[PDB]
Design a protein around this ligand. Structure first.
Ligand SMILES: *[C@@H]1O[C@H](CO)[C@@H](O[C@@H]2O[C@H](CO)[C@@H](O[C@@H]3O[C@H](CO[C@@H]4O[C@H](CO)[C@@H](O)[C@H](O)[C@@H]4O)[C@@H](O)[C@H](O[C@H]4O[C@H](CO)[C@@H](O)[C@H](O)[C@@H]4O)[C@@H]3O)[C@H](O)[C@H]2NC(C)=O)[C@H](O)[C@H]1NC(C)=O
Ligand SMILES: CC(=O)N[C@@H]1[C@@H](O)[C@H](O[C@@H]2O[C@H](CO)[C@@H](O[C@@H]3O[C@H](CO)[C@@H](O[C@@H]4O[C@H](CO)[C@@H](O)[C@H](O)[C@H]4NC(C)=O)[C@H](O)[C@H]3NC(C)=O)[C@H](O)[C@H]2NC(C)=O)[C@@H](CO)O[C@H]1O
Ligand SMILES: *[C@@H]1O[C@H](CO)[C@@H](O[C@@H]2O[C@H](CO)[C@@H](O)[C@H](O)[C@H]2NC(C)=O)[C@H](O)[C@H]1NC(C)=O
Ligand SMILES: *[C@@H]1O[C@H](CO)[C@@H](O[C@@H]2O[C@H](CO)[C@@H](O)[C@H](O)[C@H]2NC(C)=O)[C@H](O)[C@H]1NC(C)=O
Ligand SMILES: *[C@@H]1O[C@H](CO)[C@@H](O[C@@H]2O[C@H](CO)[C@@H](O)[C@H](O)[C@H]2NC(C)=O)[C@H](O)[C@H]1NC(C)=O
Length: 200
């Protein structure tokens, strides 16, 4: 890959009861190790969360994760997911991983037929990321993998992210931010609120 970076952030939208523990379990990694006790690696990136044990539906939780060159020369990370009763590839993508992955991607990279994913199977779950693009800007080197929802628009994301609309669009060329689906990459902040710069 032409770029590299020490981490990316995943934007996980909260609905139907999701808890911080489930997020940390599903998105467990070396960068956010799940031990059920210490959620600091996640909470550092979400200073808005008042109570880690009662999180608020309708908000998004930012989760740090490793961003690695994948075969095929693109950036992403393989999470691991332990299958539970009634899980399906569709549900795992749209609910368990909050559209950070797709059902097609899960089906392609796991060997279980859709109608018989065994209990306690592990799935390999790919979530893509970005380390930035020097030709767009030197100012950003940390990116949020952001699944779009019907309520988002380019102006609404520019407003909340603190990044100009033109810059967001250039990082995501040709992509309609009002389309209500798919992902865009949005520059993100360190735990102290600063944007880490691009690093070649
Ligand atoms: C994320 O998780 C996925 C799935 O587990 C991993 O995918 C595996 O990646 C490895 C490479 O690191 C794959 O092994 C390599 O297979 C090569 C053959 O592949 C082409 O694949 C395309 C489609 O993807 C096909 O169309 C072609 O027909 C080919 O098959 C093979 O050439 C290669 O050989 C070499 O490298 C190894 C070292 O890894 C040497 O030991 C060896 O001598 C040789 O030079 C590999 O065997 C593997 O097949 C993938 N597994 C699956 C299930 O797809 C990613 O690697 C994970 N990401 C990270 C960062 O680890
Ligand atoms: C892409 C996509 O998401 N497609 C959806 C389909 O996946 C979905 O079909 C349902 O898929 C699930 C997941 O594979 C499937 O559930 C599995 O069912 C088998 C039984 O057939 C279970 O295996 C048994 O478990 C018991 C223990 O509980 C064992 O005692 C027994 O030996 C096992 N049987 C066999 C033969 O191995 C799996 O445990 C179970 N997996 C999970 C994770 O629950 C459903 O059966 C599928 N249902 C149908 C109707 O095919 C489909 C649902 O409509 O929707 C698609 O969109
Ligand atoms: C979360 O994911 C990490 C990274 O894959 C897992 O890391 C392993 O942890 C054990 C025990 O500490 C080590 O011996 C292994 O070497 C680690 N593996 C790797 C590849 O780094 C960790 O186990 C995961 N946690 C859970 C609960 O699954
Ligand atoms: C992931 O995207 C899916 C598809 O848009 C979302 O599910 C849809 O949600 C709408 C309301 O937002 C429902 O009317 C549809 O029935 C849902 N479609 C499907 C396929 O179930 C889903 O909410 C998104 N996940 C998250 C966590 O935001
Ligand atoms: C992560 O990015 C890769 C590379 O763009 C995507 O892989 C492409 O996916 C499409 C649609 O399924 C396939 O037609 C291509 O064959 C894939 N290309 C390569 C190089 O593998 C992948 O879909 C993205 N992953 C997710 C979960 O969005």
């Amino acid at each position: 890959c032409r770029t590299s970076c020490p981490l990316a952030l995943a934007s996980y939208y909260l609905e139907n009861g999701t808890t911080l523990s489930v997020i940390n379990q599903n998105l467990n990694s070396s960068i956010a190790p799940y031990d059920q006790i210490n959620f600091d690696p996640i909470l550092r990136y979400n200073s808005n969360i008042k109570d880690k044990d009662r999180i608020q539906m309708g908000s998004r939780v930012l989760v740090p994760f490793p961003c690695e060159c994948q075969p095929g020369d693109f950036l992403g990370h393989n999470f691991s997911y332990s299958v539970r009763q009634e899980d399906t590839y569709e549900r795992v993508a749209i609910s368990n991983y909050a559209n950070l992955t797709t059902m097609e991607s899960l089906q392609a990279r796991n060997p279980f037929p859709a109608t018989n994913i065994p209990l306690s199977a592990t799935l390999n779950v790919l979530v893509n990321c970005s380390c930035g693009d020097e030709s767009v800007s030197k100012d950003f080197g940390l990116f949020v993998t952001y699944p779009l929802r019907p309520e988002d628009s380019l102006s609404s994301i520019a407003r909340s992210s603190g990044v100009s609309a033109d810059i967001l669009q250039r990082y995501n060329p040709g992509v309609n931010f009002n389309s209500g689906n798919g992902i865009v990459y949005v520059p993100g902040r360190d735990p102290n609120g600063a944007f880490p710069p691009f690093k070649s």
